[PDB]
Design a binder for this molecule. Sequence first.
Ligand SMILES: C=C(C)CCOP(=O)(O)OP(=O)(O)O
Ligand SMILES: CC(C)=CCSP(=O)(O)OP(=O)(O)O
Ligand SMILES: [Mg+2]
Ligand SMILES: [Mg+2]
Lengths: 229, 238
Amino acid sequence: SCSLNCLMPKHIALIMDGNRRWAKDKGLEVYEGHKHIIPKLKEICDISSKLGIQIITAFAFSTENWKRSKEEVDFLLQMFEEIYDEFSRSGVRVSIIGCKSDLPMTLQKCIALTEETTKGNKGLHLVIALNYGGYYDILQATKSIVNKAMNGLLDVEDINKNLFDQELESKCPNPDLLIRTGGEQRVSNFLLWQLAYTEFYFTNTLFPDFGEEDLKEAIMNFQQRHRRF
Amino acid sequence: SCSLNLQKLCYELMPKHIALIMDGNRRWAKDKGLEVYEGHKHIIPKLKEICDISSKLGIQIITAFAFSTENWKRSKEEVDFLLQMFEEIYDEFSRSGVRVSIIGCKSDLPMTLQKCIALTEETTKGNKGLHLVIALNYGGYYDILQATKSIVNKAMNGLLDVEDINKNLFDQELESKCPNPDLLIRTGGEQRVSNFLLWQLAYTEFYFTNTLFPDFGEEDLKEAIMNFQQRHRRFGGH
Ligand SMILES: C=C(C)CCOP(=O)(O)OP(=O)(O)O
Ligand SMILES: CC(C)=CCSP(=O)(O)OP(=O)(O)O
Ligand SMILES: [Mg+2]
Ligand SMILES: [Mg+2]
């Protein structure tokens, strides 16, 4: 029984793609590219904070990236501990979404500490999606709703867009604009439910080259789209 | 509790499944100086032509976005024009070798539209050719929510456990099922998905064109397919 008849973007979703190709093209080891991820992201938060943007959700590690080599996966998961150094004494408030229990317990602790030391910052809110996927987010929300029903807390007739939204890890307000660096035109199992009405902007610029002028261009393209539609 | 480390993706030089957002009909009629709904009167024939072109190329499924949850907010004279025009699906396809199904909330439509849809499905259910799925009163939120309700009702009746809830279970309860679209084509200039497929597009390749849908023909479709053929799909690995 169905029946069908949340100028400057508030929330930006960021897919931080193209770091290996950047390094290989410069004659560098692949890992040199990955070392630019956290510092560039910090730089983008400072630029965005000054433009009036309020939320950034950034894709750092997907649930499919476990298919890469053991060497590359081990390097990346060790490298993400620098989140604490780069952000713990900044003006940014930091959260992580994703399945934290699959990560090394040392990373779990840096994450827990980064969230703790920055929780009171009133500026920009940076959400880092680490071991995250849209399938995972929808499935964990479904399991939560199933447990509430089995405990007598809701009826099937109470399941609606609002209820489901409150069980997801990324909630309303959803991204107004998605920026994906690195040339590819696909969402790669990022924020599936949350991107239903988001504007998609794809640039060929590789993530370690994405700078203030490139961000400004994406925002101008976004403002042009709204005069039109 | 969660665990995503150890190991299920429904994707394939030729896309097996193409999703299609048909946009730009009213702008088309204005430039051509015709009545506001004449662009809409081209949807179904153009759709039949696209199925014919695609079937020759080797494409197996087309899912076409005909009427969203948000199109209920268009003017009620424009809503009636469309829903009565969709009744022409029967003349166009019941002849063909095309198999036709409709996804979406069918119980909210005119009973005349409900019977016409049932009759088209039954008549073509045996056809062996390309599978055309028409999303009518559909949306991505709707599909995920109705799948969730069906999973809750099973858990409440002891037919499954919370630990059985995984991507393949969810896949089997959604109205748009595996295999998912390899390529999405959106005509009409916009670069977004507007609550069409959500779950199904996780690794779909996107192709956006400014061409308005009534101008979208054989050469444009082959342009979209050649563009898709140049892409490199990595699915998170290397
Ligand atoms: C954390 C991120 C940015 C995941 C998406 O990038 P990928 O490189 O894994 O996406 P594909 O090109 O394989 O689809
Ligand atoms: C998946 C992560 C950690 C970053 C996205 S960039 P990458 O490693 O996928 O590099 P390429 O896209 O292969 O150039
Ligand atoms: Mg990549
Ligand atoms: Mg339109």
